[PDB]
Amino acid sequence: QEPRTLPPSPNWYCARCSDAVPGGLFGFAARTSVFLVRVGPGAGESPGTPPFRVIGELVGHTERVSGFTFSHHPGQYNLCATSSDDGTVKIWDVETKTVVTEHALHQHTISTLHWSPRVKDLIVSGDEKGVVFCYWFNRNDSQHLFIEPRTIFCLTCSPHHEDLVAIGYKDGIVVIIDISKKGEVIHRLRGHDDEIHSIAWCPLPGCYLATGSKDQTIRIWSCSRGRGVMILKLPRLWLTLHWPSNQPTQLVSSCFGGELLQWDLTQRKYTLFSQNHSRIVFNLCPLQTEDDKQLLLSTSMDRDVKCWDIATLECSWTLPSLGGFAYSLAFSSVDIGSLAIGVGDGMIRVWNTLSIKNNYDVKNFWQGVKSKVTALCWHPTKEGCLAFGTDDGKVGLYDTYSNKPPQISSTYHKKTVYTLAWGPPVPSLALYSCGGEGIVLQHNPWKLSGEAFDINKLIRDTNSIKYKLPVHTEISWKADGKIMALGNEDGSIEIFQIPNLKLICTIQQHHKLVNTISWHHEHGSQPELSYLMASGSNNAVIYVHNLKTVIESSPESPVTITEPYRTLSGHTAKITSVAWSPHHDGRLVSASYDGTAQVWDALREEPLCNFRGHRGRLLCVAWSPLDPDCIYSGADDFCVHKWLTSMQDHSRPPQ
């Protein structure tokens, strides 16, 4: 197939944290990285599929990237500069995705930056204390300009003059300054009554300037007269601008709710765009494809990236994104394409991966959830029935086909929900949930307002035992649905059979709390393969257990196992998830806090493939139910990557 990537939402409230270069390359700041996107006939997508692809990630900054600008100089269209909350300004080469050179000249938090449209190596960056810094990376020269003690919001270099730079400030003041004359204020533009959000120059010599402010107005100044000549009032808010070179008469602005407007300059005549943004738009980026098509990309607080066809004024494609950790990934057993994602922004994403019109066809389910979704589980036989657990202990049951809010279980866990599972009830299918406090309880999906029955009562009454039952940290049903497994904080793995939960085996092999348990599917070539059980804990070592010998025994007295059938070693951090491949015999994928996902032949104990695209701790893995080479994985880097095992260059976890 083709690898995909669900990137983190672009950063909010940034005057210029995204840019594009002609031909089809768009970059946007998101968390501590910059994500590059090929756009147009350069992506090489199938017909019907939107012509874009994520291919790049700028890794390096230690905290939030607050600015990003591309070099528009010919021959240098592959160079870009970023500004971070760590006070660095790094120059990148996008072909190599490495840092050319960086500085740390700013002593106060950086606001924005911009690449000189007329100087091949000049970078101008401002900070919150009003300090402006001109930087040339060829000879590593820096001029320390200080204009006014006002917080800088936006900064834009003149396209036509090599030494003029316009600056917008939080108090509504706009000043124009000469870089050669020691930062001499050339003009002081007073008119705006709130924060300046965007400064746009006229792309034609002879000059003119445009500014958009939180006072809901757009002002157009004359750098000759040093005052405004026309004022446009829109009909919270961020007001960014775009003055297209092809249409010098027109001017495109953002508006309330992320609406976009195209201001004609014959009168106040505007045209409304349109599949529309639902929250305020921060940046507008234009790019021209090789196909001579003029597009405009928009980032917004609604966590989407939209590409607009300037000719039709309608939305070509929409790129969703994530705002939280990808806690949970689950594929529906009936809808092969449905990929449910549990995100730390309380919102459940269902990714129809089978959509042929759209590669990123994702649907959001926010209503009803107000906390991070740490567990998901599709119903085995029911299309659209999806259960979810939250970080504060709430258990739900969505209906993705309906439009109603989810059904929240009346019984909440005291801690975060670790995992969910569908199995047979004990006192057609019932819902099982494991809390962080150690309690596993069973929910009736039909009578859902009734209390949840704590299954530890059952374990104590069937298995003659008054023991203080351990802290349960896992639950995983056998494929047949006749055997249940529990993981515990000590590291034990109790095995249960029958409907009364007769404990018949305790697996004391791990030495920290269990974090994942997965049974092998029964579709394989051999039958005994169904009895294999993978498990991971806070130890970096993964164990496989064959339980055929004990389940066919079904002893009256439980047994204890201390030798594992297979031992997978290589990880260097705790294991978060393991999943058996449905397409192979004994093929296991594992995620770990080492930042890697690892495929191995669990039968021969052979490491096959190691995925290192993530820049954080992986929290979930799911095998693609339709492509035997494809795996989806999500991490605490706000990403979900879809990768192929054959295209990875490393076969083993790093050491």
XYZ file of C-alpha atoms in Angstrom:
655
model
C 0.000 0.000 0.000
C 0.984 3.602 0.722
C 1.996 4.756 4.224
C -0.139 7.410 5.889
C 0.152 9.681 8.927
C -2.398 11.427 11.156
C -0.379 14.465 12.311
C -0.906 16.542 15.462
C -3.164 19.548 15.109
C -1.349 22.683 13.903
C -0.419 25.019 16.746
C -2.920 27.735 17.639
C -2.585 31.526 17.935
C 0.506 31.822 15.734
C 0.789 34.663 13.224
C 2.937 32.507 10.865
C 3.496 28.866 11.829
C 2.870 27.424 8.354
C 4.125 28.134 4.836
C 4.156 26.637 1.354
C 6.465 26.731 -1.668
C 5.392 26.312 -5.319
C 5.108 22.922 -6.969
C 3.487 21.346 -3.925
C 5.179 21.413 -0.520
C 3.299 22.641 2.547
C 4.706 22.732 6.073
C 2.842 23.498 9.276
C 3.953 23.785 12.896
C 2.435 21.189 15.219
C 3.646 20.694 18.795
C 7.484 20.379 18.679
C 7.710 19.454 14.974
C 6.985 20.781 11.490
C 5.069 18.420 9.193
C 5.758 18.578 5.461
C 3.044 17.733 2.944
C 3.419 17.147 -0.781
C 0.499 18.746 -2.632
C -0.774 18.337 -6.176
C 0.316 16.050 -9.015
C 3.575 15.512 -7.123
C 2.035 13.253 -4.488
C 1.159 10.617 -7.089
C -2.145 9.580 -5.545
C -4.716 7.377 -7.233
C -7.602 9.003 -9.137
C -10.471 10.188 -6.974
C -8.017 10.513 -4.071
C -7.022 14.079 -3.034
C -3.551 14.894 -4.329
C -1.612 15.249 -1.094
C 0.684 13.108 1.055
C 2.496 13.592 4.360
C 6.151 12.692 3.890
C 8.148 14.887 6.235
C 8.695 15.717 9.875
C 11.106 18.355 11.180
C 12.328 16.905 14.488
C 14.641 18.919 16.718
C 12.954 21.568 18.863
C 12.401 20.811 22.549
C 9.063 22.632 22.971
C 6.318 24.361 20.996
C 7.264 25.618 17.535
C 5.877 29.150 17.330
C 6.866 29.993 13.747
C 7.790 28.530 10.363
C 8.815 30.180 7.106
C 9.993 28.890 3.737
C 12.704 30.351 1.512
C 11.045 31.600 -1.678
C 14.394 32.193 -3.384
C 14.927 30.147 -6.575
C 17.235 27.191 -6.076
C 16.679 27.507 -2.323
C 12.981 26.521 -2.244
C 14.076 23.578 -0.047
C 15.206 25.700 2.932
C 13.037 26.717 5.883
C 13.451 28.409 9.269
C 11.604 27.638 12.514
C 11.199 29.489 15.812
C 10.571 27.602 19.048
C 9.702 28.295 22.658
C 13.206 27.038 23.490
C 14.530 30.288 22.009
C 16.257 28.626 19.083
C 15.861 29.627 15.446
C 16.821 26.608 13.366
C 17.502 26.502 9.631
C 16.402 23.225 8.066
C 17.044 21.417 4.792
C 13.794 19.651 3.913
C 15.422 17.222 1.461
C 17.479 15.842 4.373
C 15.147 16.977 7.218
C 18.230 18.054 9.212
C 19.287 21.343 10.792
C 21.717 23.403 8.717
C 22.500 25.829 11.556
C 20.731 27.363 14.544
C 21.114 30.276 16.943
C 19.905 31.220 20.425
C 20.080 35.017 20.198
C 16.664 35.781 21.690
C 16.532 36.272 25.451
C 12.732 36.549 25.606
C 10.059 34.208 24.262
C 9.996 34.376 20.466
C 6.794 35.495 18.729
C 7.246 34.982 14.981
C 9.839 34.995 12.209
C 10.039 35.466 8.460
C 12.454 34.734 5.625
C 13.513 37.820 3.664
C 11.828 37.669 0.220
C 14.761 39.693 -1.181
C 17.826 38.399 0.735
C 18.718 34.756 0.113
C 19.934 34.184 3.681
C 18.243 36.785 5.929
C 15.993 35.655 8.788
C 14.108 38.248 10.848
C 12.608 37.139 14.161
C 10.824 39.062 16.890
C 10.057 38.182 20.508
C 7.480 39.114 23.153
C 9.674 41.885 24.611
C 9.803 43.712 21.266
C 13.347 42.670 20.307
C 13.927 42.110 16.590
C 16.903 40.069 15.368
C 18.156 40.031 11.785
C 20.099 36.881 11.017
C 22.195 35.913 8.004
C 23.255 32.275 8.172
C 25.894 32.478 5.424
C 28.408 34.476 7.484
C 26.545 34.076 10.814
C 25.882 37.786 11.257
C 23.288 39.200 13.635
C 21.920 42.703 14.080
C 20.208 43.417 17.410
C 17.382 45.854 16.677
C 14.990 47.121 19.339
C 12.136 49.316 18.156
C 9.461 49.597 20.852
C 8.725 47.916 24.242
C 5.507 46.387 22.881
C 4.730 42.695 22.461
C 5.347 41.591 18.869
C 2.567 39.570 17.256
C 3.310 39.418 13.526
C 6.281 40.362 11.390
C 6.477 40.572 7.603
C 9.359 41.602 5.366
C 8.721 43.755 2.318
C 8.723 41.748 -0.931
C 9.974 44.745 -2.911
C 12.422 46.483 -0.548
C 15.377 44.555 0.870
C 15.621 46.693 4.020
C 12.007 47.392 5.075
C 10.127 45.180 7.559
C 6.608 45.711 8.926
C 5.810 44.734 12.522
C 2.448 44.245 14.243
C 2.014 44.541 18.005
C -0.477 43.315 20.601
C -1.656 46.886 21.313
C -2.716 47.515 17.706
C 0.296 49.604 16.695
C 1.984 48.879 13.350
C 5.462 50.238 12.579
C 7.607 50.057 9.440
C 11.380 50.065 9.900
C 14.536 50.121 7.779
C 16.978 47.279 8.462
C 19.896 49.338 7.126
C 19.209 52.516 9.165
C 19.732 50.806 12.558
C 16.027 49.970 12.722
C 14.856 53.548 12.187
C 11.072 53.792 12.381
C 10.055 54.821 8.865
C 6.317 54.954 9.605
C 4.165 54.565 12.706
C 0.691 53.384 11.705
C -1.982 54.122 14.315
C -5.577 53.040 13.788
C -6.112 49.534 15.096
C -7.598 49.150 18.568
C -6.553 45.545 19.370
C -3.982 42.859 18.568
C -2.486 42.779 15.090
C -2.829 39.306 13.602
C -1.402 39.548 10.077
C 0.482 42.005 7.866
C 0.261 41.552 4.090
C 2.095 43.674 1.523
C 0.844 44.516 -1.940
C 2.578 42.157 -4.409
C 2.936 45.015 -6.921
C 5.523 47.827 -6.627
C 3.709 51.081 -5.926
C 3.651 51.066 -1.825
C 0.572 49.554 -0.153
C 0.087 47.547 3.031
C -2.687 45.498 4.629
C -3.274 44.582 8.268
C -5.943 42.560 10.038
C -6.696 43.047 13.724
C -8.801 41.654 16.555
C -10.814 44.889 16.392
C -12.669 43.099 13.552
C -11.269 45.491 10.929
C -8.821 45.272 8.039
C -6.834 48.437 7.336
C -4.964 49.333 4.154
C -2.181 51.899 4.557
C -0.033 53.979 2.234
C 3.667 53.851 3.078
C 3.909 57.168 1.220
C 1.224 59.028 3.185
C 1.902 57.081 6.388
C -1.809 56.612 7.081
C -4.735 54.432 6.117
C -6.648 54.788 2.876
C -9.457 52.236 3.310
C -10.962 50.254 6.179
C -12.860 46.973 5.847
C -14.949 45.680 8.752
C -15.824 41.997 8.977
C -19.506 40.923 9.057
C -13.630 34.987 19.257
C -11.617 35.804 16.137
C -8.222 35.588 14.481
C -7.869 37.781 11.400
C -5.150 36.558 9.024
C -4.655 37.846 5.500
C -3.576 36.748 2.019
C -2.924 39.214 -0.815
C -2.657 37.084 -3.983
C -0.152 38.140 -6.626
C -2.410 36.924 -9.456
C -5.268 39.107 -8.171
C -3.727 42.316 -6.790
C -7.222 43.831 -6.598
C -8.506 41.017 -4.412
C -7.724 40.310 -0.765
C -8.587 37.172 1.218
C -9.171 37.327 4.969
C -10.198 35.007 7.727
C -13.391 35.795 9.624
C -15.447 34.685 12.612
C -15.843 30.936 12.983
C -13.080 30.320 10.459
C -15.127 31.561 7.541
C -13.035 32.905 4.677
C -13.784 36.049 2.677
C -12.443 37.383 -0.623
C -12.566 41.161 -0.583
C -13.019 42.759 -3.987
C -11.708 46.295 -4.133
C -14.300 48.075 -6.272
C -16.400 49.371 -3.354
C -17.475 46.588 0.735
C -17.906 43.671 -1.683
C -16.832 40.254 -0.413
C -17.485 36.686 -1.538
C -18.042 33.840 0.919
C -16.151 30.549 0.659
C -18.649 27.710 0.061
C -17.382 21.538 4.147
C -16.459 24.738 5.975
C -14.208 25.521 8.933
C -16.047 25.457 12.264
C -13.506 27.464 14.313
C -11.242 30.431 13.649
C -8.567 30.171 10.940
C -5.024 31.052 11.982
C -2.946 30.870 8.776
C -3.628 31.085 5.055
C -0.918 29.619 2.807
C -1.013 29.770 -1.016
C 0.860 27.437 -3.307
C 0.881 26.779 -7.049
C 1.040 23.176 -8.231
C 3.012 22.089 -11.275
C -0.437 21.715 -12.886
C -0.777 25.547 -12.829
C -3.516 25.310 -10.184
C -3.674 28.003 -7.501
C -4.478 26.563 -4.079
C -4.786 28.127 -0.634
C -4.234 26.097 2.525
C -5.832 27.111 5.815
C -5.096 26.030 9.384
C -7.670 26.429 12.115
C -8.553 25.856 15.748
C -11.000 23.172 14.576
C -7.924 20.893 14.201
C -8.324 20.563 10.412
C -6.162 21.627 7.486
C -8.194 22.619 4.439
C -6.950 23.221 0.894
C -9.092 25.610 -1.145
C -9.329 25.856 -4.922
C -8.916 29.607 -5.467
C -10.749 29.399 -8.794
C -13.920 27.750 -7.449
C -13.608 29.131 -3.874
C -14.465 25.672 -2.550
C -12.654 23.114 -0.421
C -10.707 20.480 -2.370
C -9.615 18.262 0.517
C -9.522 18.332 4.307
C -6.698 16.955 6.461
C -7.809 16.015 10.003
C -5.404 15.959 12.951
C -5.058 14.956 16.590
C -4.915 17.038 19.754
C -4.118 14.360 22.341
C -2.147 11.196 22.865
C -3.378 8.283 20.764
C -4.258 6.096 23.724
C -6.233 3.359 21.963
C -6.539 1.843 18.480
C -9.195 -0.698 17.549
C -10.453 -2.150 14.275
C -14.053 -3.240 13.819
C -14.540 -6.948 13.207
C -17.481 -6.277 10.850
C -16.543 -2.942 9.225
C -13.047 -3.861 8.050
C -12.056 -0.256 7.436
C -13.299 1.323 10.663
C -10.344 2.398 12.798
C -11.416 3.839 16.152
C -8.890 6.149 17.821
C -8.838 7.190 21.464
C -7.376 10.687 21.737
C -6.358 12.729 24.776
C -8.659 15.585 23.721
C -11.754 13.606 24.741
C -12.755 13.085 21.102
C -13.198 9.646 19.503
C -12.026 9.387 15.891
C -13.374 6.680 13.588
C -11.129 6.360 10.545
C -12.827 4.679 7.594
C -9.630 3.365 6.028
C -11.594 1.827 3.140
C -12.814 5.143 1.723
C -11.698 5.327 -1.899
C -12.647 9.001 -2.267
C -10.659 10.080 0.810
C -7.491 8.821 2.444
C -8.179 10.725 5.660
C -11.933 10.163 6.031
C -12.235 10.562 9.803
C -15.383 11.224 11.836
C -15.328 12.884 15.254
C -17.438 11.896 18.278
C -16.957 14.657 20.870
C -20.445 15.053 22.340
C -20.827 13.053 25.531
C -17.093 12.796 26.328
C -15.185 15.457 28.271
C -12.039 13.485 29.241
C -9.251 11.593 27.487
C -10.336 8.331 25.824
C -7.959 5.681 27.163
C -9.821 2.559 25.983
C -11.854 1.513 22.936
C -13.412 -1.788 21.904
C -15.608 -2.534 18.887
C -18.510 -4.930 19.300
C -17.648 -8.306 17.688
C -20.916 -8.820 15.767
C -22.569 -5.370 15.859
C -21.646 -2.825 13.202
C -21.477 0.673 14.663
C -21.521 -0.416 18.317
C -18.329 0.907 19.930
C -17.565 1.019 23.653
C -15.120 3.439 25.229
C -13.516 4.080 28.594
C -12.251 7.455 29.760
C -9.445 8.784 31.941
C -11.778 9.533 34.881
C -13.365 6.065 34.916
C -16.412 6.579 32.684
C -17.582 3.746 30.416
C -19.648 4.488 27.318
C -21.258 2.802 24.329
C -21.423 4.895 21.160
C -23.503 4.211 18.053
C -21.466 5.596 15.151
C -24.431 5.213 12.799
C -26.718 7.164 15.134
C -26.419 10.837 16.017
C -27.348 10.549 19.706
C -24.871 11.012 22.573
C -23.273 7.816 23.887
C -24.735 5.650 26.627
C -22.651 6.221 29.766
C -22.540 3.353 32.251
C -23.945 4.212 35.680
C -20.914 2.604 37.386
C -17.637 4.526 37.135
C -14.134 3.343 38.018
C -12.180 5.220 40.683
C -9.154 5.484 38.355
C -8.500 5.609 34.615
C -9.924 2.856 32.419
C -7.097 0.693 31.107
C -8.863 -1.653 28.686
C -12.245 -2.953 27.529
C -13.260 -6.362 26.191
C -16.367 -8.163 24.938
C -16.967 -11.608 26.399
C -19.690 -13.921 27.657
C -21.589 -12.623 30.724
C -21.550 -14.589 33.983
C -24.372 -13.634 36.322
C -25.652 -12.359 24.339
C -22.343 -10.604 25.042
C -21.387 -8.465 28.029
C -18.929 -5.595 28.332
C -15.840 -5.958 30.526
C -13.828 -2.989 31.806
C -10.646 -2.828 33.879
C -9.935 0.188 36.057
C -6.613 1.582 37.212
C -7.512 0.858 40.835
C -7.534 -2.888 40.087
C -11.269 -3.598 39.809
C -12.660 -5.395 36.759
C -16.436 -5.221 36.434
C -19.020 -6.378 33.911
C -21.619 -4.155 32.236
C -24.918 -5.252 30.747
C -25.034 -3.525 27.329
C -28.842 -3.694 27.230
C -29.798 -2.756 30.796
C -27.031 -0.165 31.069
C -28.390 2.064 33.857
C -28.149 -0.877 36.249
C -25.115 -1.240 38.462
C -22.035 -3.106 37.259
C -21.348 -6.462 38.894
C -17.808 -6.725 40.266
C -16.458 -10.055 39.002
C -14.078 -10.416 41.963
C -17.152 -11.578 43.903
C -17.412 -14.439 41.424
C -13.737 -15.401 41.581
C -13.964 -15.599 45.380
C -17.161 -17.688 45.440
C -16.433 -20.166 42.637
C -12.730 -20.587 43.391
C -12.924 -21.282 47.138
C -10.841 -18.282 48.249
C -11.073 -15.376 50.716
C -7.680 -13.990 49.596
C -7.365 -10.264 48.960
C -7.639 -10.569 45.189
C -4.835 -8.746 43.336
C -4.904 -5.403 41.553
C -6.106 -6.265 38.039
C -4.436 -4.320 35.225
C -5.566 -6.332 32.175
C -8.315 -8.439 30.664
C -8.189 -10.444 27.437
C -10.636 -13.113 26.339
C -9.626 -16.207 24.421
C -10.774 -16.154 20.799
C -13.382 -18.871 21.387
C -14.759 -16.825 24.282
C -14.461 -19.683 26.784
C -11.191 -18.665 28.502
C -10.458 -15.331 30.193
C -7.100 -13.863 31.202
C -6.309 -11.235 33.839
C -3.060 -9.348 34.312
C -2.097 -8.078 37.743
C 0.122 -5.429 39.305
C 2.535 -8.018 40.720
C 3.083 -9.488 37.250
C 0.908 -12.596 37.560
C -1.462 -13.673 34.797
C -4.435 -15.596 36.169
C -6.311 -17.774 33.665
C -10.037 -18.465 34.010
C -12.339 -20.936 32.268
C -16.008 -21.954 32.289
C -18.788 -19.462 33.042
C -18.139 -19.381 36.792
C -14.491 -18.422 36.249
C -12.705 -21.451 37.677
C -9.046 -20.467 37.985
C -6.986 -23.272 36.458
C -3.625 -21.593 35.780
C -1.503 -18.780 37.200
C 1.362 -17.559 35.010
C 4.045 -16.060 37.269
C 6.560 -14.969 34.627
C 6.655 -11.151 34.551
C 7.970 -9.073 37.452
C 6.037 -5.804 37.006
C 2.394 -4.982 36.327
C 0.988 -6.396 33.083
C 0.083 -3.809 30.425
C -1.101 -5.913 27.476
C -2.320 -9.461 26.782
C -3.244 -10.861 23.364
C -4.484 -14.290 22.304
C -3.576 -15.731 18.915
C -6.411 -16.015 16.407
C -7.923 -19.370 15.461
C -7.763 -18.768 11.670
C -4.240 -20.182 11.385
C -3.028 -23.266 9.560
C -2.620 -25.283 12.767
C -5.303 -25.514 15.476
C -3.028 -25.391 18.534
C -1.974 -21.867 17.493
C -5.129 -20.555 19.163
C -3.666 -21.483 22.569
C -0.753 -19.019 22.281
C -0.863 -15.969 24.552
C 1.362 -12.899 24.348
C 1.905 -10.586 27.315
C 3.835 -7.433 28.131
C 4.579 -5.602 31.365
C 6.696 -2.682 32.557
C 9.667 -4.971 31.899
C 11.121 -4.677 28.426
C 10.925 -8.486 27.936
C 7.953 -10.061 26.138
C 6.741 -13.597 26.839
C 4.585 -16.014 24.839
C 2.745 -18.822 26.611
C 1.272 -21.961 25.071
C -1.675 -22.974 27.260
C -2.918 -25.969 25.258
C -1.448 -28.341 27.833
C -3.426 -26.859 30.737
C -6.767 -26.044 29.082
C -7.287 -29.540 27.676
C -6.458 -30.722 31.206
C -9.067 -28.505 32.898
C -7.759 -29.515 36.342
C -9.770 -29.303 39.535
C -6.700 -27.697 41.143
C -5.031 -24.788 39.311
C -1.411 -25.166 38.242
C 1.480 -22.694 38.175
C 3.620 -22.045 35.086
C 7.123 -20.588 35.317
C 8.760 -21.435 31.975
C 7.577 -19.563 28.861
C 6.990 -21.189 25.489
C 8.826 -18.347 23.715
C 10.790 -15.319 24.937
C 11.023 -12.176 22.799
C 13.863 -9.891 23.906
C 15.126 -6.650 22.423
C 13.028 -3.793 23.735
C 14.631 -1.343 26.172
C 11.502 0.115 27.818
C 8.071 -0.928 29.074
C 5.656 -2.727 26.746
C 2.367 -0.968 26.035
C 0.588 -3.211 23.529
C 1.017 -6.466 21.639
C -1.197 -7.708 18.827
C -1.170 -10.928 16.833
C -1.235 -10.678 13.092
C -4.393 -12.190 11.538
C -2.607 -12.957 8.254
C 0.329 -15.025 9.522
C 1.080 -17.870 11.900
C 2.755 -16.570 15.059
C 3.572 -13.013 13.947
C 3.590 -10.492 16.788
C 3.824 -6.709 16.865
C 4.773 -4.851 20.025
C 4.880 -1.207 21.072
C 7.186 0.081 23.798
C 8.209 3.253 25.598
C 11.480 3.114 23.631
C 9.675 4.924 20.810
C 9.649 1.907 18.489
C 7.207 -0.691 17.222
C 8.712 -4.113 16.607
C 7.495 -7.028 14.486
C 8.922 -10.484 15.222
C 8.271 -14.085 14.301
C 7.308 -15.146 17.820
C 7.683 -18.854 16.995
C 11.314 -18.681 15.838
C 12.005 -15.732 18.231
C 13.333 -13.753 15.249
C 13.064 -9.938 15.082
C 11.838 -9.017 11.605
C 11.009 -5.304 11.461
C 11.416 -2.226 13.687
C 9.433 0.983 13.215
C 11.088 4.198 14.441
C 9.018 6.943 12.804
C 7.451 7.954 16.116
C 9.079 10.647 18.237
C 7.402 9.625 21.495
C 6.272 6.669 23.597
C 4.022 4.291 21.675
C 0.727 3.473 23.378
C -1.158 1.283 20.900
C -0.751 -1.017 17.894
C -3.326 -2.632 15.645
C -2.697 -4.788 12.606
C -4.461 -3.764 9.423
C -7.190 -6.416 8.997
C -6.898 -6.287 5.176
C -3.207 -5.690 4.308
C -0.789 -8.312 5.723
C 2.111 -5.828 5.514
C 0.442 -2.817 7.126
C 0.335 -1.804 10.806
C -1.209 1.202 12.564
C 0.437 2.621 15.674
C -0.213 5.602 17.919
C 2.046 7.256 20.460
C 2.216 10.150 22.914
C 3.621 12.374 20.151
C 0.055 13.201 19.019
C 0.619 11.008 15.935
C -0.880 7.871 14.464
C 1.377 6.337 11.813
C 0.355 3.714 9.259
C 3.466 1.871 8.110
C 4.528 -1.175 6.104
C 6.750 -3.880 7.569
C 8.560 -4.411 4.264
C 9.618 -0.762 3.875
C 11.419 -0.436 7.217
C 15.227 -0.279 7.256
C 15.812 -1.559 10.811
C 14.974 -5.077 11.994
C 15.569 -4.675 15.734
C 14.855 -2.296 18.626
C 17.636 0.250 19.194
C 20.045 -0.501 22.013
